[PDB]
């Protein structure tokens, strides 16, 4: 117990679970389910057996529109998904009691491969999961269908794509939630390279679950990046609890208060009132014209409250329009209003606003970006805010009625189907609360 701070745990439905919970019970350094989420993300791979079969049958391997004539292989892979599953398990398993898991999805058209944790314990990075699964698949297919020596390279091309010529996965039929280590924007950015659409697809468009999932990952990445070291730790912990894990039902209460006829401004007024009420902020000086300049009592807790209000404002505004495209404007002017309403710094001391400025630019211009769901913490446009801008973006894509061209239905079909099946991934907030109550007194 390094911090005196206490939090009340409320769920996705707004029901109270437990009171007087230490803040550190939600820390990635103590919470067991957050540890399970990281471990599982690193060891889970989504396999498209249907894709591998179609790629081998047509000879369409190595990226977009690339086809090799005369190298076709007609193999009943999907039909024999059972034997392939058993083969993949036999190759990846160490002991008959480890977490090695190979599950068939959508009538054997897709597979969900989970490496035993021990393989990762002796691995420097996460890319092992993609490599070992690919190898396990090649050997499984080649041995089952007695594939000839001169044809076997096409099996590799159907699974891994244009590797090793391309230092990325190009035209591959196996996917992870994490991108290649070579596409990292900075050091320790690995857990930020999760597309918004992937979070939304996995959580099955559940706002609270998507916010929780994105916040958990973004904040755990802030610890990996070293941004949560020392004096900054308490800022990110309060950020994670109030913004992502609905601490004291703050997010929900703000949505409840402004969901009916409330605007972004009304949410700003609601959070300022609650912040003043809880003694998080106070009046510095009364100025001419009657404007009161405010000063923070608890800088870290003020940012946490403001961050919670940001998620709430996105839910309210994007929810009123049922369009995800609004998020970039919402994040911007939520922060812009809150600064000229109180004279206090915005979420992430303007970084969240700055991110939103670039986000608006790269979601309404010719220079780059795209639709809200295409972004991630590792994108050049949305890396600036230290875990406070991506979770609200997830809430906008959850709300969207279908305005977007690049929807999770188009970008995250495979990943969505595999990860939504896992209980902790689909409903993170629920298991994170249970995990907080599991280590509550142990800290």
């Amino acid at each position: 117990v390094k911090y005196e701070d206490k939090i009340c745990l409320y769920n996705a439905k707004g029901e109270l679970v437990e009171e007087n919970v230490p803040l550190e019970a939600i820390s990635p350094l103590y919470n067991p389910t957050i540890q399970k989420l990281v471990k599982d993300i690193k060891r889970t791979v989504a396999v498209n057996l249907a894709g591998i079969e179609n790629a081998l049958k047509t000879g369409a391997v190595g990226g977009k529109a690339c086809v090799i004539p005369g190298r076709t292989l007609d193999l009943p892979i999907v039909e024999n998904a059972e034997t392939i599953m058993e083969y993949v398990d036999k190759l990846l398993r160490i002991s008959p009691d480890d977490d090695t898991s190979v599950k068939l999805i959508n009538d054997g058209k897709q597979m969900a491969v989970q490496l035993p944790s021990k393989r990762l314990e002796v691995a420097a990075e996460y890319s092992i999961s993609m490599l070992n699964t690919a190898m396990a698949l090649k050997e499984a297919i080649i041995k089952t269908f007695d594939v000839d020596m001169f044809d076997a390279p096409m099996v590799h091309a159907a699974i891994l794509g244009r590797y090793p010529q391309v230092p990325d996965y190009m035209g591959a039929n196996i996917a992870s939630l994490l991108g290649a280590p070579t596409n990292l924007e900075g050091l320790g950015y690995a857990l930020r390279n999760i597309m918004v659409n992937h979070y939304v697809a996995t959580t099955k468009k559940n706002i609270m679950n998507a916010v929780a999932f994105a916040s958990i990952m973004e904040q755990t990445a802030m610890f990996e990046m070293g941004d949560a070291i020392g004096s900054f730790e308490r800022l990110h912990l309060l950020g994670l609890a109030y913004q992502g894990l609905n601490a004291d039902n703050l997010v929900i209460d703000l949505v409840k208060a402004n969901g009916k006829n409330g605007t972004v401004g009304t949410v700003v007024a609601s959070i300022v009132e609650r912040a003043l009420e809880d003694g998080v902020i106070t009046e510095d000086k009364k100025m001419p014209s009657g404007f009161v300049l405010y000063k923070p009592v608890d800088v870290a807790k003020w940012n946490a409250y403001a961050a919670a209000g940001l998620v709430a404002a996105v839910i309210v505004n994007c929810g009123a329009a049922r369009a995800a495209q609004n998020v970039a404007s919402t994040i911007l002017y939520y922060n812009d209003i809150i600064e000229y309403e109180t004279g206090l710094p915005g979420v992430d001391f303007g970084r969240a606003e700055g991110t939103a400025v670039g986000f608006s630019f790269f979601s309404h211009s010719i220079y780059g970006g795209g639709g809200p769901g295409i972004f991630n913490g590792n994108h050049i446009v949305t890396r600036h805010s230290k875990g406070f801008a991506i979770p609200p973006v997830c809430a906008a894509m959850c709300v969207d009625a279908g305005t977007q061209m690049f929807s999770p239905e188009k970008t995250s079909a495979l990943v969505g189907a595999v990860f939504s099946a896992i209980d902790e991934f689909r409903e993170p907030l629920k298991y994170v609360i249970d995990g907080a109550l599991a280590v509550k007194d142990k800290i």
């Binding site: 929900i252 006829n261 401004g265 940012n303 009123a320 329009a321 049922r322 404007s329 309403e341 709300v399």
Partner: protein, 252 residues
């Protein structure tokens, strides 16, 4: 809690506060029929049905989400109408409305808003059905717009920072406006039916309604309150970025 909206001692800052204040309803200085508005917008002809991008929410099989269903969607989202826009280029020469002023006002007064601030243009993207309604009821009707100083333009927005013409109107490379009467839609396509927007306000009349600081108008250096607030925000951001501790924040 009663909102403060914006800091500042001057009337310019007070006009910004009045614009942001949803309780303050400014006078209808002009009257433009809705049919004429829809034609200026140019996304559909008056009488043409509303184009739908997605089916109505009432017919969508959405799973249970307690938090999601706390937000009452706007009228345009309920029927699943198309997302269209309206863009304004405000003159730096005492225009009643300003880019960041517009954005702050929209985010304070309206629901389901997607607005974009730029130096030479200010876009507002919303559900077509409610957008026409808000364009007509606020943007067109209220004291916010001046036909001579606030030009409606979707493309070729150049003119916000340019000198006025022989008449006193703002520059328009597509001459959308020429009584102040618009001859073309915001895109550039000439209208078969021109639209009269009414009279223009003189410079001397616009000084008391404008939301811009100018030397010839109200210099910003005269408003020491606003300057103290900006300097405060800048310092708070700097200190916060250096160390987010209460000890460092004593240097405010």
């Amino acid at each position: 809690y009663k909102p403060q909206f914006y800091p500042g001692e001057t009337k310019i800052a007070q006009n910004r506060r009045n614009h942001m204040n949803p309780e303050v309803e400014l006078e209808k200085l002009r009257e433009i029929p809705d049919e004429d508005v829809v034609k200026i917008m140019g996304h559909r002809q008056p009488g043409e049905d509303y184009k739908t991008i997605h089916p109505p929410l009432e017919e969508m099989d959405l799973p249970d989400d307690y938090v999601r269903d706390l937000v009452e969607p706007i009228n345009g989202a309920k029927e699943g109408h198309r997302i269209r826009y309206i863009q304004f280029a405000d003159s730096m020469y005492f225009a009643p409305a300003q880019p960041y002023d517009r954005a702050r006002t929209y985010m304070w007064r309206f629901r389901g808003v997607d607005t974009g601030t730029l130096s030479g243009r200010q876009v507002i993207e919303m559900r077509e059905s409610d957008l026409e309604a808000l364009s007509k009821n606020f943007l067109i009707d209220t004291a916010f717009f001046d036909p001579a100083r606030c030009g409606i333009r979707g493309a070729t927005v150049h003119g916000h920072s340019l000198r006025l013409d022989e008449n006193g109107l703002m520059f328009d490379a597509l001459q959308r406006y020429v009584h102040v009467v618009y001859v073309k839609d915001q895109v550039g396509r000439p209208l078969d039916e021109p639209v009269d927007v009414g009279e223009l306000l003189p410079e001397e009349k616009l000084r008391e309604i404008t939301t811009i600081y100018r030397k010839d108008g109200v210099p910003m250096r005269e408003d020491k309150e606003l300057l103290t607030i900006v300097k405060r925000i800048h310092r708070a951001r700097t200190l916060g970025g250096f160390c987010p501790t209460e000890d460092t924040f004593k240097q405010l």
